[PDB]
Amino acid sequence: GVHKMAKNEFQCMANMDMLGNCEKHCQTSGEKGYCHGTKCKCGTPLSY
C-alpha cells in the first residue's frame, strides 16, 4: 500500500538507491530485502 514492497521494482540496481542499508536485516529474519537507499525494507515472499 504505502510503499513499493516487492522484488519487481528497484532490484537493488537503481542509479541512486542501490546501496540499500538492510543487506543482512532481511535474511537474518528469513524474509526478502528491497533496496531504496536508507528507506530499505524487507518482506515475506507471500503465497496465493
Side-chain angles (χ1 to χ4, degrees):
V2 301
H3 194 200
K4 277 170 173 176
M5 292 282 288
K7 285 171 60 167
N8 61 350
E9 290 267 333
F10 311 101
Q11 311 198 3
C12 217
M13 289 172 72
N15 314 94
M16 59 284 300
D17 288 302
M18 74 183 70
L19 305 180
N21 80 331
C22 72
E23 184 68 36
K24 284 158 42 172
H25 197 60
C26 316
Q27 69 71 234
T28 199
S29 191
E31 305 325 322
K32 316 306 195 185
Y34 317 130
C35 299
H36 339 64
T38 71
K39 300 285 180 179
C40 196
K41 282 107 156 59
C42 324
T44 52
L46 293 173
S47 64
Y48 171 51

